[PDB]
PDB file of N, CA and C in Angstrom:
ATOM      1  N   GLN A   1      12.020  18.405  16.579  1.00  0.00           N
ATOM      2  CA  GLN A   1      11.353  18.125  15.136  1.00  0.00           C
ATOM      3  C   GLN A   1      12.207  17.001  14.438  1.00  0.00           C
ATOM      4  N   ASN A   2      11.741  16.606  13.351  1.00  0.00           N
ATOM      5  CA  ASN A   2      12.193  15.527  12.252  1.00  0.00           C
ATOM      6  C   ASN A   2      13.158  16.337  11.075  1.00  0.00           C
ATOM      7  N   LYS A   3      13.734  15.482  10.359  1.00  0.00           N
ATOM      8  CA  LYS A   3      14.396  15.835   9.203  1.00  0.00           C
ATOM      9  C   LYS A   3      13.613  16.034   8.059  1.00  0.00           C
ATOM     10  N   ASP A   4      13.887  16.757   6.862  1.00  0.00           N
ATOM     11  CA  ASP A   4      13.057  16.918   5.581  1.00  0.00           C
ATOM     12  C   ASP A   4      13.195  15.687   4.707  1.00  0.00           C
ATOM     13  N   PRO A   5      12.149  15.509   3.957  1.00  0.00           N
ATOM     14  CA  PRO A   5      12.186  14.051   3.052  1.00  0.00           C
ATOM     15  C   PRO A   5      13.481  13.620   2.345  1.00  0.00           C
ATOM     16  N   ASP A   6      13.932  14.481   1.181  1.00  0.00           N
ATOM     17  CA  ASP A   6      15.149  14.524   0.705  1.00  0.00           C
ATOM     18  C   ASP A   6      16.135  13.688   1.310  1.00  0.00           C
ATOM     19  N   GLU A   7      16.739  14.629   2.418  1.00  0.00           N
ATOM     20  CA  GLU A   7      17.809  13.992   3.387  1.00  0.00           C
ATOM     21  C   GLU A   7      17.540  12.733   4.047  1.00  0.00           C
ATOM     22  N   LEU A   8      16.236  12.565   4.559  1.00  0.00           N
ATOM     23  CA  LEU A   8      16.001  11.630   5.673  1.00  0.00           C
ATOM     24  C   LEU A   8      16.713  10.155   5.494  1.00  0.00           C
ATOM     25  N   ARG A   9      17.418   9.617   6.568  1.00  0.00           N
ATOM     26  CA  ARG A   9      17.525   8.168   6.554  1.00  0.00           C
ATOM     27  C   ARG A   9      18.056   7.547   7.928  1.00  0.00           C
ATOM     28  N   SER A  10      18.081   6.446   8.109  1.00  0.00           N
ATOM     29  CA  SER A  10      18.070   5.668   9.289  1.00  0.00           C
ATOM     30  C   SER A  10      19.435   6.255  10.137  1.00  0.00           C
ATOM     31  N   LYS A  11      19.176   6.214  11.406  1.00  0.00           N
ATOM     32  CA  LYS A  11      20.081   6.531  12.328  1.00  0.00           C
ATOM     33  C   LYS A  11      21.627   5.871  11.828  1.00  0.00           C
ATOM     34  N   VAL A  12      21.457   4.315  11.595  1.00  0.00           N
ATOM     35  CA  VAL A  12      22.823   3.486  11.345  1.00  0.00           C
ATOM     36  C   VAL A  12      22.362   3.175   9.741  1.00  0.00           C
ATOM     37  N   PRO A  13      23.241   3.201   8.721  1.00  0.00           N
ATOM     38  CA  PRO A  13      23.110   2.802   7.560  1.00  0.00           C
ATOM     39  C   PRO A  13      22.956   1.535   7.533  1.00  0.00           C
ATOM     40  N   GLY A  14      22.110   0.913   6.488  1.00  0.00           N
ATOM     41  CA  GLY A  14      21.796  -0.460   6.310  1.00  0.00           C
ATOM     42  C   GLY A  14      20.922  -1.094   7.453  1.00  0.00           C
ATOM     43  N   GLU A  15      20.384  -0.563   8.496  1.00  0.00           N
ATOM     44  CA  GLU A  15      19.816  -0.987   9.501  1.00  0.00           C
ATOM     45  C   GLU A  15      18.728  -0.078   9.869  1.00  0.00           C
ATOM     46  N   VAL A  16      17.393  -0.586   9.751  1.00  0.00           N
ATOM     47  CA  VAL A  16      16.347   0.356  10.022  1.00  0.00           C
ATOM     48  C   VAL A  16      15.645  -0.536  11.476  1.00  0.00           C
ATOM     49  N   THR A  17      15.369   0.391  12.410  1.00  0.00           N
ATOM     50  CA  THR A  17      14.783  -0.021  13.834  1.00  0.00           C
ATOM     51  C   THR A  17      13.546   0.588  13.940  1.00  0.00           C
ATOM     52  N   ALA A  18      12.758   0.084  14.968  1.00  0.00           N
ATOM     53  CA  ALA A  18      11.583   0.727  15.280  1.00  0.00           C
ATOM     54  C   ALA A  18      11.607   2.171  15.548  1.00  0.00           C
ATOM     55  N   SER A  19      12.725   2.859  16.030  1.00  0.00           N
ATOM     56  CA  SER A  19      12.856   4.223  16.481  1.00  0.00           C
ATOM     57  C   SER A  19      12.968   4.993  14.877  1.00  0.00           C
ATOM     58  N   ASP A  20      13.418   4.430  14.004  1.00  0.00           N
ATOM     59  CA  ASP A  20      13.597   5.138  12.643  1.00  0.00           C
ATOM     60  C   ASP A  20      12.130   5.403  12.224  1.00  0.00           C
ATOM     61  N   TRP A  21      11.091   4.408  12.489  1.00  0.00           N
ATOM     62  CA  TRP A  21       9.713   4.640  12.129  1.00  0.00           C
ATOM     63  C   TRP A  21       8.899   5.527  13.059  1.00  0.00           C
ATOM     64  N   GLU A  22       9.116   5.121  14.295  1.00  0.00           N
ATOM     65  CA  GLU A  22       8.260   5.798  15.252  1.00  0.00           C
ATOM     66  C   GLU A  22       8.531   7.235  15.262  1.00  0.00           C
ATOM     67  N   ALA A  23       9.601   7.822  15.173  1.00  0.00           N
ATOM     68  CA  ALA A  23       9.938   9.016  15.202  1.00  0.00           C
ATOM     69  C   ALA A  23       9.163   9.967  14.071  1.00  0.00           C
ATOM     70  N   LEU A  24       8.720   9.168  13.038  1.00  0.00           N
ATOM     71  CA  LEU A  24       7.924   9.728  12.003  1.00  0.00           C
ATOM     72  C   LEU A  24       6.468   9.610  12.098  1.00  0.00           C
ATOM     73  N   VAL A  25       6.129   8.691  13.126  1.00  0.00           N
ATOM     74  CA  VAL A  25       4.648   8.687  13.262  1.00  0.00           C
ATOM     75  C   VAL A  25       3.984  10.030  13.692  1.00  0.00           C
ATOM     76  N   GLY A  26       2.907  10.404  13.148  1.00  0.00           N
ATOM     77  CA  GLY A  26       2.259  11.679  13.445  1.00  0.00           C
ATOM     78  C   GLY A  26       2.614  12.827  12.742  1.00  0.00           C
ATOM     79  N   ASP A  27       3.572  12.677  11.901  1.00  0.00           N
ATOM     80  CA  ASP A  27       4.389  13.735  11.177  1.00  0.00           C
ATOM     81  C   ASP A  27       3.828  13.703   9.861  1.00  0.00           C
ATOM     82  N   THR A  28       2.988  14.766   9.391  1.00  0.00           N
ATOM     83  CA  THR A  28       2.340  14.521   8.215  1.00  0.00           C
ATOM     84  C   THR A  28       3.038  14.809   6.795  1.00  0.00           C
ATOM     85  N   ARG A  29       4.312  14.941   7.027  1.00  0.00           N
ATOM     86  CA  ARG A  29       5.407  14.769   5.770  1.00  0.00           C
ATOM     87  C   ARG A  29       5.371  13.406   5.514  1.00  0.00           C
ATOM     88  N   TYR A  30       5.222  12.476   6.411  1.00  0.00           N
ATOM     89  CA  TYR A  30       5.521  11.008   6.240  1.00  0.00           C
ATOM     90  C   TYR A  30       4.391  10.110   6.036  1.00  0.00           C
ATOM     91  N   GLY A  31       3.185  10.553   6.720  1.00  0.00           N
ATOM     92  CA  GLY A  31       2.049   9.813   6.419  1.00  0.00           C
ATOM     93  C   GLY A  31       0.748  10.786   6.922  1.00  0.00           C
ATOM     94  N   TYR A  32      -0.183  10.106   7.116  1.00  0.00           N
ATOM     95  CA  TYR A  32      -1.692  10.593   7.399  1.00  0.00           C
ATOM     96  C   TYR A  32      -2.340   9.720   8.317  1.00  0.00           C
ATOM     97  N   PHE A  33      -3.309  10.219   9.097  1.00  0.00           N
ATOM     98  CA  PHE A  33      -4.230   9.513   9.846  1.00  0.00           C
ATOM     99  C   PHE A  33      -5.487   9.104   9.031  1.00  0.00           C
ATOM    100  N   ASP A  34      -5.770   7.951   8.739  1.00  0.00           N
ATOM    101  CA  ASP A  34      -6.857   7.386   7.788  1.00  0.00           C
ATOM    102  C   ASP A  34      -8.413   7.845   8.290  1.00  0.00           C
ATOM    103  N   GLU A  35      -9.326   7.321   7.509  1.00  0.00           N
ATOM    104  CA  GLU A  35     -10.511   7.462   8.044  1.00  0.00           C
ATOM    105  C   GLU A  35     -10.829   6.955   9.428  1.00  0.00           C
ATOM    106  N   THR A  36     -10.373   5.885   9.750  1.00  0.00           N
ATOM    107  CA  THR A  36     -10.668   5.199  10.841  1.00  0.00           C
ATOM    108  C   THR A  36      -9.801   5.833  12.124  1.00  0.00           C
ATOM    109  N   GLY A  37      -8.737   6.784  11.950  1.00  0.00           N
ATOM    110  CA  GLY A  37      -7.841   6.943  12.950  1.00  0.00           C
ATOM    111  C   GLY A  37      -6.466   6.137  12.864  1.00  0.00           C
ATOM    112  N   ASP A  38      -5.898   5.895  11.800  1.00  0.00           N
ATOM    113  CA  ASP A  38      -4.921   4.723  11.863  1.00  0.00           C
ATOM    114  C   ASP A  38      -3.835   5.495  10.917  1.00  0.00           C
ATOM    115  N   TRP A  39      -2.580   5.310  11.398  1.00  0.00           N
ATOM    116  CA  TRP A  39      -1.597   5.926  10.486  1.00  0.00           C
ATOM    117  C   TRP A  39      -1.167   5.243   9.425  1.00  0.00           C
ATOM    118  N   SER A  40      -1.171   5.994   8.220  1.00  0.00           N
ATOM    119  CA  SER A  40      -0.813   5.174   7.073  1.00  0.00           C
ATOM    120  C   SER A  40       0.418   6.141   6.499  1.00  0.00           C
ATOM    121  N   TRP A  41       1.158   5.380   5.754  1.00  0.00           N
ATOM    122  CA  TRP A  41       2.589   6.077   5.446  1.00  0.00           C
ATOM    123  C   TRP A  41       2.664   6.395   3.885  1.00  0.00           C
ATOM    124  N   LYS A  42       3.141   7.425   3.592  1.00  0.00           N
ATOM    125  CA  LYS A  42       3.543   7.876   2.355  1.00  0.00           C
ATOM    126  C   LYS A  42       4.784   7.527   1.734  1.00  0.00           C
ATOM    127  N   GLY A  43       5.736   6.733   2.461  1.00  0.00           N
ATOM    128  CA  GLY A  43       6.910   6.095   1.956  1.00  0.00           C
ATOM    129  C   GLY A  43       7.390   4.990   2.836  1.00  0.00           C
ATOM    130  N   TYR A  44       8.598   4.753   2.780  1.00  0.00           N
ATOM    131  CA  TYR A  44       9.350   3.651   3.560  1.00  0.00           C
ATOM    132  C   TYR A  44      10.941   3.647   3.581  1.00  0.00           C
ATOM    133  N   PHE A  45      11.487   3.071   4.373  1.00  0.00           N
ATOM    134  CA  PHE A  45      12.836   2.843   4.228  1.00  0.00           C
ATOM    135  C   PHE A  45      13.364   1.902   3.337  1.00  0.00           C
ATOM    136  N   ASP A  46      14.111   1.979   2.648  1.00  0.00           N
ATOM    137  CA  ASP A  46      14.826   1.311   1.508  1.00  0.00           C
ATOM    138  C   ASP A  46      15.879   0.226   2.004  1.00  0.00           C
ATOM    139  N   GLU A  47      16.343  -0.463   1.307  1.00  0.00           N
ATOM    140  CA  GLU A  47      17.471  -1.515   1.660  1.00  0.00           C
ATOM    141  C   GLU A  47      18.649  -0.607   2.370  1.00  0.00           C
ATOM    142  N   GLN A  48      19.038   0.359   1.786  1.00  0.00           N
ATOM    143  CA  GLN A  48      19.874   1.460   2.143  1.00  0.00           C
ATOM    144  C   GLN A  48      19.710   1.942   3.635  1.00  0.00           C
ATOM    145  N   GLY A  49      18.528   1.988   3.831  1.00  0.00           N
ATOM    146  CA  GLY A  49      18.077   2.905   5.004  1.00  0.00           C
ATOM    147  C   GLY A  49      17.580   4.238   4.787  1.00  0.00           C
ATOM    148  N   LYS A  50      17.519   4.524   3.297  1.00  0.00           N
ATOM    149  CA  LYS A  50      17.085   5.715   2.786  1.00  0.00           C
ATOM    150  C   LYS A  50      15.520   5.820   2.697  1.00  0.00           C
ATOM    151  N   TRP A  51      14.958   6.946   3.048  1.00  0.00           N
ATOM    152  CA  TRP A  51      13.458   7.062   2.810  1.00  0.00           C
ATOM    153  C   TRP A  51      13.118   7.040   1.526  1.00  0.00           C
ATOM    154  N   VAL A  52      12.145   6.214   1.005  1.00  0.00           N
ATOM    155  CA  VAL A  52      11.549   6.706  -0.297  1.00  0.00           C
ATOM    156  C   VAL A  52      10.042   6.809  -0.452  1.00  0.00           C
ATOM    157  N   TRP A  53       9.554   7.318  -1.351  1.00  0.00           N
ATOM    158  CA  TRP A  53       8.095   7.520  -1.443  1.00  0.00           C
ATOM    159  C   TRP A  53       7.240   6.593  -2.284  1.00  0.00           C
ATOM    160  N   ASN A  54       6.057   6.610  -2.294  1.00  0.00           N
ATOM    161  CA  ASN A  54       5.311   5.576  -2.800  1.00  0.00           C
ATOM    162  C   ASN A  54       4.931   6.038  -4.302  1.00  0.00           C
ATOM    163  N   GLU A  55       4.092   6.987  -4.609  1.00  0.00           N
ATOM    164  CA  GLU A  55       3.635   7.584  -5.811  1.00  0.00           C
ATOM    165  C   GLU A  55       3.016   6.478  -6.678  1.00  0.00           C
TER     166      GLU A  55
ATOM    167  N   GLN B   1      17.031 -20.891   0.726  1.00  0.00           N
ATOM    168  CA  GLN B   1      15.603 -20.991   0.599  1.00  0.00           C
ATOM    169  C   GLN B   1      15.107 -20.106   1.546  1.00  0.00           C
ATOM    170  N   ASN B   2      14.778 -19.183   0.764  1.00  0.00           N
ATOM    171  CA  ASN B   2      13.710 -17.748   1.361  1.00  0.00           C
ATOM    172  C   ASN B   2      12.279 -18.341   1.562  1.00  0.00           C
ATOM    173  N   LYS B   3      11.601 -17.912   2.653  1.00  0.00           N
ATOM    174  CA  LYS B   3      10.180 -18.172   2.815  1.00  0.00           C
ATOM    175  C   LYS B   3       9.529 -17.314   1.929  1.00  0.00           C
ATOM    176  N   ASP B   4       8.137 -17.770   1.730  1.00  0.00           N
ATOM    177  CA  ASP B   4       7.188 -17.224   0.779  1.00  0.00           C
ATOM    178  C   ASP B   4       6.749 -15.779   1.380  1.00  0.00           C
ATOM    179  N   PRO B   5       6.087 -14.970   0.492  1.00  0.00           N
ATOM    180  CA  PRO B   5       6.120 -13.447   1.078  1.00  0.00           C
ATOM    181  C   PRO B   5       5.190 -13.264   2.127  1.00  0.00           C
ATOM    182  N   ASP B   6       4.017 -13.945   2.142  1.00  0.00           N
ATOM    183  CA  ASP B   6       3.116 -13.840   3.259  1.00  0.00           C
ATOM    184  C   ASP B   6       3.707 -14.199   4.730  1.00  0.00           C
ATOM    185  N   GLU B   7       4.721 -15.173   4.647  1.00  0.00           N
ATOM    186  CA  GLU B   7       5.374 -15.743   5.812  1.00  0.00           C
ATOM    187  C   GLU B   7       6.629 -15.018   6.102  1.00  0.00           C
ATOM    188  N   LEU B   8       7.110 -14.403   5.106  1.00  0.00           N
ATOM    189  CA  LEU B   8       8.609 -13.901   5.208  1.00  0.00           C
ATOM    190  C   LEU B   8       8.707 -12.724   6.417  1.00  0.00           C
ATOM    191  N   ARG B   9       9.672 -12.870   7.265  1.00  0.00           N
ATOM    192  CA  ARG B   9      10.013 -11.688   8.027  1.00  0.00           C
ATOM    193  C   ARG B   9      11.558 -11.691   8.347  1.00  0.00           C
ATOM    194  N   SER B  10      11.863 -10.352   9.080  1.00  0.00           N
ATOM    195  CA  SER B  10      13.145  -9.975   9.479  1.00  0.00           C
ATOM    196  C   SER B  10      13.771 -10.992  10.462  1.00  0.00           C
ATOM    197  N   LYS B  11      15.080 -11.076  10.265  1.00  0.00           N
ATOM    198  CA  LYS B  11      15.926 -12.182  11.127  1.00  0.00           C
ATOM    199  C   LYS B  11      15.647 -11.631  12.408  1.00  0.00           C
ATOM    200  N   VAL B  12      15.985 -10.531  12.637  1.00  0.00           N
ATOM    201  CA  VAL B  12      16.076 -10.144  14.182  1.00  0.00           C
ATOM    202  C   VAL B  12      14.623  -9.281  14.441  1.00  0.00           C
ATOM    203  N   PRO B  13      13.719  -9.539  15.364  1.00  0.00           N
ATOM    204  CA  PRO B  13      12.463  -8.850  15.344  1.00  0.00           C
ATOM    205  C   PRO B  13      12.704  -7.551  15.752  1.00  0.00           C
ATOM    206  N   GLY B  14      11.876  -6.539  15.356  1.00  0.00           N
ATOM    207  CA  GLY B  14      12.182  -5.090  15.586  1.00  0.00           C
ATOM    208  C   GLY B  14      13.126  -4.367  14.964  1.00  0.00           C
ATOM    209  N   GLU B  15      14.047  -5.055  13.944  1.00  0.00           N
ATOM    210  CA  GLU B  15      15.075  -4.516  13.276  1.00  0.00           C
ATOM    211  C   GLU B  15      15.266  -5.195  11.759  1.00  0.00           C
ATOM    212  N   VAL B  16      15.443  -4.552  10.847  1.00  0.00           N
ATOM    213  CA  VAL B  16      15.729  -4.833   9.489  1.00  0.00           C
ATOM    214  C   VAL B  16      17.217  -4.284   8.973  1.00  0.00           C
ATOM    215  N   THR B  17      17.772  -5.324   8.509  1.00  0.00           N
ATOM    216  CA  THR B  17      19.206  -4.947   7.940  1.00  0.00           C
ATOM    217  C   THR B  17      19.301  -5.479   6.661  1.00  0.00           C
ATOM    218  N   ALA B  18      20.386  -5.022   5.914  1.00  0.00           N
ATOM    219  CA  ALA B  18      20.542  -5.380   4.579  1.00  0.00           C
ATOM    220  C   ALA B  18      20.395  -6.809   4.453  1.00  0.00           C
ATOM    221  N   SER B  19      21.118  -7.576   5.248  1.00  0.00           N
ATOM    222  CA  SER B  19      21.201  -9.046   4.997  1.00  0.00           C
ATOM    223  C   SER B  19      19.749  -9.604   4.970  1.00  0.00           C
ATOM    224  N   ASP B  20      18.762  -9.045   5.421  1.00  0.00           N
ATOM    225  CA  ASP B  20      17.441  -9.490   5.229  1.00  0.00           C
ATOM    226  C   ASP B  20      16.856  -9.275   3.827  1.00  0.00           C
ATOM    227  N   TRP B  21      17.319  -8.255   3.123  1.00  0.00           N
ATOM    228  CA  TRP B  21      17.075  -8.084   1.684  1.00  0.00           C
ATOM    229  C   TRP B  21      17.982  -8.825   0.747  1.00  0.00           C
ATOM    230  N   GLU B  22      19.294  -8.903   1.426  1.00  0.00           N
ATOM    231  CA  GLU B  22      20.432  -9.721   0.478  1.00  0.00           C
ATOM    232  C   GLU B  22      19.997 -10.988   0.059  1.00  0.00           C
ATOM    233  N   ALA B  23      19.451 -11.769   1.145  1.00  0.00           N
ATOM    234  CA  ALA B  23      18.911 -13.253   0.801  1.00  0.00           C
ATOM    235  C   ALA B  23      17.815 -13.258  -0.274  1.00  0.00           C
ATOM    236  N   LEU B  24      17.068 -12.088  -0.662  1.00  0.00           N
ATOM    237  CA  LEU B  24      15.958 -12.069  -1.611  1.00  0.00           C
ATOM    238  C   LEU B  24      16.371 -11.754  -2.956  1.00  0.00           C
ATOM    239  N   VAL B  25      17.525 -11.036  -3.171  1.00  0.00           N
ATOM    240  CA  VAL B  25      18.146 -10.660  -4.385  1.00  0.00           C
ATOM    241  C   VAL B  25      18.118 -11.830  -5.364  1.00  0.00           C
ATOM    242  N   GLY B  26      17.653 -11.739  -6.511  1.00  0.00           N
ATOM    243  CA  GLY B  26      17.587 -12.894  -7.462  1.00  0.00           C
ATOM    244  C   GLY B  26      16.523 -13.826  -7.169  1.00  0.00           C
ATOM    245  N   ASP B  27      15.649 -13.616  -6.045  1.00  0.00           N
ATOM    246  CA  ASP B  27      14.580 -14.440  -5.846  1.00  0.00           C
ATOM    247  C   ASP B  27      13.314 -13.544  -6.653  1.00  0.00           C
ATOM    248  N   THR B  28      12.712 -14.085  -7.586  1.00  0.00           N
ATOM    249  CA  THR B  28      12.062 -13.682  -8.634  1.00  0.00           C
ATOM    250  C   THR B  28      10.794 -13.100  -7.911  1.00  0.00           C
ATOM    251  N   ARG B  29      10.159 -13.836  -7.156  1.00  0.00           N
ATOM    252  CA  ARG B  29       8.977 -13.654  -6.069  1.00  0.00           C
ATOM    253  C   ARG B  29       9.122 -12.036  -5.867  1.00  0.00           C
ATOM    254  N   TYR B  30      10.349 -11.646  -5.300  1.00  0.00           N
ATOM    255  CA  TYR B  30      10.566 -10.591  -4.453  1.00  0.00           C
ATOM    256  C   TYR B  30      11.002  -9.380  -5.148  1.00  0.00           C
ATOM    257  N   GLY B  31      11.517  -9.604  -6.423  1.00  0.00           N
ATOM    258  CA  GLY B  31      12.123  -8.468  -7.285  1.00  0.00           C
ATOM    259  C   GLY B  31      12.407  -9.170  -8.808  1.00  0.00           C
ATOM    260  N   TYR B  32      12.834  -8.120  -9.594  1.00  0.00           N
ATOM    261  CA  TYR B  32      13.349  -8.598 -10.927  1.00  0.00           C
ATOM    262  C   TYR B  32      14.241  -7.874 -11.491  1.00  0.00           C
ATOM    263  N   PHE B  33      15.322  -8.593 -12.324  1.00  0.00           N
ATOM    264  CA  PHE B  33      16.420  -7.873 -13.137  1.00  0.00           C
ATOM    265  C   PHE B  33      15.755  -7.284 -14.316  1.00  0.00           C
ATOM    266  N   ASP B  34      16.011  -6.002 -14.592  1.00  0.00           N
ATOM    267  CA  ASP B  34      15.884  -5.420 -16.022  1.00  0.00           C
ATOM    268  C   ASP B  34      16.805  -6.035 -16.938  1.00  0.00           C
ATOM    269  N   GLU B  35      16.767  -5.283 -18.221  1.00  0.00           N
ATOM    270  CA  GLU B  35      17.484  -5.965 -19.224  1.00  0.00           C
ATOM    271  C   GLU B  35      19.077  -5.674 -19.205  1.00  0.00           C
ATOM    272  N   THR B  36      19.389  -4.736 -18.640  1.00  0.00           N
ATOM    273  CA  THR B  36      20.654  -4.460 -18.061  1.00  0.00           C
ATOM    274  C   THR B  36      21.332  -4.894 -16.731  1.00  0.00           C
ATOM    275  N   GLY B  37      20.325  -5.673 -16.371  1.00  0.00           N
ATOM    276  CA  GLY B  37      20.943  -6.398 -14.717  1.00  0.00           C
ATOM    277  C   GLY B  37      20.670  -5.695 -13.463  1.00  0.00           C
ATOM    278  N   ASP B  38      19.886  -4.477 -13.569  1.00  0.00           N
ATOM    279  CA  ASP B  38      19.528  -3.945 -12.222  1.00  0.00           C
ATOM    280  C   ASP B  38      18.424  -4.695 -11.803  1.00  0.00           C
ATOM    281  N   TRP B  39      18.339  -4.871 -10.206  1.00  0.00           N
ATOM    282  CA  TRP B  39      17.461  -5.526  -9.492  1.00  0.00           C
ATOM    283  C   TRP B  39      16.526  -4.339  -8.992  1.00  0.00           C
ATOM    284  N   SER B  40      15.124  -4.581  -9.326  1.00  0.00           N
ATOM    285  CA  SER B  40      14.210  -3.881  -8.786  1.00  0.00           C
ATOM    286  C   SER B  40      13.341  -4.756  -7.881  1.00  0.00           C
ATOM    287  N   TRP B  41      12.931  -3.958  -6.780  1.00  0.00           N
ATOM    288  CA  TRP B  41      11.997  -4.469  -5.783  1.00  0.00           C
ATOM    289  C   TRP B  41      10.947  -4.503  -5.961  1.00  0.00           C
ATOM    290  N   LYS B  42      10.125  -5.606  -5.662  1.00  0.00           N
ATOM    291  CA  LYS B  42       8.433  -5.249  -5.821  1.00  0.00           C
ATOM    292  C   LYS B  42       7.751  -4.933  -4.436  1.00  0.00           C
ATOM    293  N   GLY B  43       8.679  -4.598  -3.437  1.00  0.00           N
ATOM    294  CA  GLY B  43       7.988  -4.335  -2.108  1.00  0.00           C
ATOM    295  C   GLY B  43       9.199  -4.071  -0.933  1.00  0.00           C
ATOM    296  N   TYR B  44       8.829  -4.236   0.290  1.00  0.00           N
ATOM    297  CA  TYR B  44       9.765  -3.942   1.185  1.00  0.00           C
ATOM    298  C   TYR B  44       9.408  -4.427   2.554  1.00  0.00           C
ATOM    299  N   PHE B  45      10.225  -4.206   3.686  1.00  0.00           N
ATOM    300  CA  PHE B  45       9.862  -4.671   5.028  1.00  0.00           C
ATOM    301  C   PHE B  45       9.206  -3.542   5.650  1.00  0.00           C
ATOM    302  N   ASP B  46       8.155  -3.531   6.530  1.00  0.00           N
ATOM    303  CA  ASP B  46       7.482  -2.572   7.166  1.00  0.00           C
ATOM    304  C   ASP B  46       8.057  -2.545   8.521  1.00  0.00           C
ATOM    305  N   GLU B  47       7.515  -1.710   9.403  1.00  0.00           N
ATOM    306  CA  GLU B  47       7.901  -1.549  10.826  1.00  0.00           C
ATOM    307  C   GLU B  47       8.042  -2.816  11.554  1.00  0.00           C
ATOM    308  N   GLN B  48       7.299  -3.829  11.307  1.00  0.00           N
ATOM    309  CA  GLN B  48       7.182  -4.915  12.137  1.00  0.00           C
ATOM    310  C   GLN B  48       8.140  -6.050  11.577  1.00  0.00           C
ATOM    311  N   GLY B  49       8.857  -5.597  10.553  1.00  0.00           N
ATOM    312  CA  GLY B  49       9.609  -6.780   9.639  1.00  0.00           C
ATOM    313  C   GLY B  49       8.823  -7.675   8.703  1.00  0.00           C
ATOM    314  N   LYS B  50       7.828  -7.222   8.246  1.00  0.00           N
ATOM    315  CA  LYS B  50       6.967  -8.109   7.473  1.00  0.00           C
ATOM    316  C   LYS B  50       6.905  -7.661   6.055  1.00  0.00           C
ATOM    317  N   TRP B  51       7.056  -8.574   5.047  1.00  0.00           N
ATOM    318  CA  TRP B  51       7.218  -7.938   3.655  1.00  0.00           C
ATOM    319  C   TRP B  51       5.856  -7.190   3.476  1.00  0.00           C
ATOM    320  N   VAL B  52       5.720  -6.164   2.705  1.00  0.00           N
ATOM    321  CA  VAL B  52       4.667  -5.756   2.026  1.00  0.00           C
ATOM    322  C   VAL B  52       4.953  -5.150   0.661  1.00  0.00           C
ATOM    323  N   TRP B  53       3.957  -5.280  -0.180  1.00  0.00           N
ATOM    324  CA  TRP B  53       4.069  -4.778  -1.728  1.00  0.00           C
ATOM    325  C   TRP B  53       4.002  -3.416  -1.882  1.00  0.00           C
ATOM    326  N   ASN B  54       4.726  -2.705  -2.809  1.00  0.00           N
ATOM    327  CA  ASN B  54       4.201  -1.440  -3.103  1.00  0.00           C
ATOM    328  C   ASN B  54       2.742  -1.858  -4.147  1.00  0.00           C
ATOM    329  N   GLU B  55       1.739  -1.518  -3.478  1.00  0.00           N
ATOM    330  CA  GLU B  55       0.493  -2.159  -3.860  1.00  0.00           C
ATOM    331  C   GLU B  55       0.135  -1.475  -5.186  1.00  0.00           C
TER     332      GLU B  55
END
C-alpha cells in the first residue's frame, strides 16, 4: 500500500519521476476515475516534491 | 528565456527537478510575488512534465 496525504512526498526530495505518480494511480485518496474511465487527480507534487491538494 | 506555457516542459523527459521550476521564478506568466515578496505559483508540472494551471 501507499502513504497517507499529510506525509506523502517523492522518493527523492526536489525530484519527481514517473514512479512517484504511478504509485498513486488507482488509489482513491489521490484521484478518481472520471465519467469516461480516465484517472483524474486531486492534487500534485510541488517544487519540493511534497504532495499538495487542489481545492 | 523560458518558453511559453503551452510549449513549456521538463528538462529531462519523465523527470521534474527543482531547476525546472527555478528557471520560472519571477517569470510573471508562471507565478507572482505578493506584497511581502513570496512567490506564488499559478500551476505545476504534470506526470509528462507539461505545465498545467491550477484551473
